[PDB]
Design a binder for this molecule. Sequence first.
Ligand code: A2G
Length: 7
Amino acid sequence: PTTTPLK
Ligand SMILES: *[C@H]1O[C@H](CO)[C@H](O)[C@H](O)[C@H]1NC(C)=O
């Protein structure tokens, strides 16, 4: 898995 917030 990979984290990539977007908010
Ligand atoms: C995490 O980053 C990886 C790097 O390519 C992918 O883009 C993947 O889709 C990302 N996961 C999420 C949940 O955005």
